[PDB]
């Protein structure tokens, strides 16, 4: 995250850290006790699928304070329409091997209904993005979880204001074009969380952008509202052997 602030410990309780062989891979969002939403592109280069770990209740990566909860990732589900190395359909649904325990520091973000998300949440201007990604373009990653308030743009306005992948119906733009504030590498997969009448909802996934905080460009987020029914169906399904599952979309 570029130009944000430290998320006070426990105020981003749905944030997930994904690790591979103990190394920082990506962010994610807890949506109930066994299910995490992340970005498909986070898994393009995974060699050992059995060493993926999700950490909940993380805050300061330099210390252990006892609020952290680690779980093996039992399943990574990716839409059939996602092509590795490209930007469209950038979503993954992760099943944990064992549920996390909900606590003051571990709480799921609500996955909204589609209609609610499209008709109401999509018009809330500002939303929060968070992660342990790079604090600057070409810079070091954060040791404390960072958070940033970003405004959403209509895709026609994003394309007009921006000056190379297309912005599809499965994406949206948010952030700033003045190079001050943005998500960045390392934040991929993390939440874009939207507040409405006292409650927070998952509306986007940190996906991509032209560098980070690049003048004339905005951050691009997976439009989660397109995947609600796909996610809901998968969460009712029984696990299959093997970690990676490609599932038909729609």
């Amino acid at each position: 995250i570029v130009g944000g602030k430290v998320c006070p410990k426990g105020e981003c309780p749905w944030q997930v850290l994904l690790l591979v062989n103990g190394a920082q891979l990506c962010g994610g969002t807890l949506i109930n006790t066994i299910w995490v939403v992340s970005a498909a592109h986070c898994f393009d280069k995974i060699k050992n699928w059995r060493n993926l770990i999700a950490v909940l209740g993380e805050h300061d990566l330099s210390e252990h304070d006892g609020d952290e909860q680690s779980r093996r990732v039992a399943q990574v589900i990716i839409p059939s329409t996602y092509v590795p190395g490209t930007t469209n359909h950038d979503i993954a649904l992760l099943r944990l091997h064992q549920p996390v325990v909900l606590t003051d520091h571990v709480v799921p973000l609500c996955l909204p209904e589609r209609t609610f998300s499209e008709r109401t949440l999509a018009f809330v201007r500002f939303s929060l993005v968070s992660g342990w990604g790079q604090l600057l373009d070409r810079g070091a990653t954060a040791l404390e979880l960072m958070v940033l308030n970003v405004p959403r743009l209509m895709t026609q306005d994003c394309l007009q204001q921006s000056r190379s992948p297309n912005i599809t119906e499965y994406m949206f733009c948010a952030g700033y074009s003045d190079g001050s504030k943005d998500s960045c590498k390392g934040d991929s997969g993390g939440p874009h969380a939207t507040h409405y009448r006292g409650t927070w909802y998952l509306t986007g996934i940190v996906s991509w952008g032209q560098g980070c905080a690049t003048v004339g460009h905005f951050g691009v987020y997976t439009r989660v509202s397109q995947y609600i029914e796909w996610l809901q169906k998968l969460m009712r399904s029984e696990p299959r052997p093997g970690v990676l599952l490609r599932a038909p979309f729609p």
Partner: peptide, 14 residues
Amino acid sequence: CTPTVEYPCGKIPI
């Protein structure tokens, strides 16, 4: 809508 559980989604306990 009112919570029925200790840790409902989308609310920040602290």
